Design a protein around this ligand. Structure first.
Ligand SMILES: CCCCCCCCCCCCCCCCCC(=O)OC[C@H](COP(=O)([O-])OCC(O)COP(=O)([O-])OC[C@@H](COC(=O)CCCCCCCCCCCCCCCCC)OC(=O)CCCCCCCCCCCCCCCCC)OC(=O)CCCCCCCCCCCCCCCCC
Lengths: 74, 60
């Protein structure tokens, strides 16, 4: 019947929308890889920043190294 | 082995490779910092009295 043939033709009318739904599915699996790569980036540029900023991103945990040199002058 | 398995570190941090790599980079960042700080303290204790900051210079 022509009615049946019409519904079969229309079954694939929303190709473009289904490709967009594919985009979402794949990008949701891939986007978490930004965290490992992000930690390493900050890890690399941390020593090139000022001392004042290095103590802020760590909540006062980080401090200058104490190796026993360059102490105050009497 | 029973104690390790009861922390659920495998289920939450090592079963998924994306999270496994988060664990590697994060733990390595913190561990490397504690390792250096500890070795500096040992160095200062063994060498007490010989380093520059331990003997203030007196002017004539
Ligand atoms: C069962 C088995 C058990 C076995 C036994 C146990 C095993 C384990 C034992 C391990 C013991 C330790 C072992 C030693 C390890 C450490 C030593 C070591 O390795 O040192 C390296 C060693 C020397 O180390 P070093 O450089 O002296 O170390 C200095 C420090 O790094 C000093 O660094 P720094 O001072 O410059 O910077 C430090 C700074 C660095 O700081 C930073 O960079 C960033 C700081 C700001 C972070 C801001 C974060 C903001 C967001 C916070 C979010 C919070 C959420 C809270 C949620 C709460 C929820 C309730 O960090 C801090 O200040 C501390 C951090 C405090 C803040 C807390 C936050 C931390 C970050 C957290 C991130 C997120 C984690 C979770 C993620 C997942 C969930 C989301 O180097 C060598 O030996 C080099 C040798 C030569 C290597 C040659 C390599 C090959 C060369 C050829 C290459 C070409 C060929 C290719 C080859 C490729 C091969 C692969």
């Amino acid at each position: 019947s022509r009615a049946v043939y019409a519904k079969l033709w229309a079954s694939t009318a929303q190709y473009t929308q289904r490709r967009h739904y594919a985009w979402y599915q794949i990008w949701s699996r891939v986007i978490p890889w930004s965290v490992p790569w992000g930690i390493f980036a900050m890890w690399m540029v941390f020593p090139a920043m000022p001392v004042e900023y290095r103590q802020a991103l760590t909540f006062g945990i980080w401090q200058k190294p104490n190796i026993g040199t360059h102490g105050p002058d009497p | 082995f029973k104690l390790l398995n009861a922390t659920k570190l495998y289920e939450y941090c090592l079963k998924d490779n994306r999270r496994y790599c988060m664990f590697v980079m994060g733990v390595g960042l913190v561990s490397s910092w504690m390792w250096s700080e500890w070795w500096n303290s040992v160095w200062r204790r063994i060498n007490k009295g010989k380093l520059y900051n331990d003997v203030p210079y007196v002017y004539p």
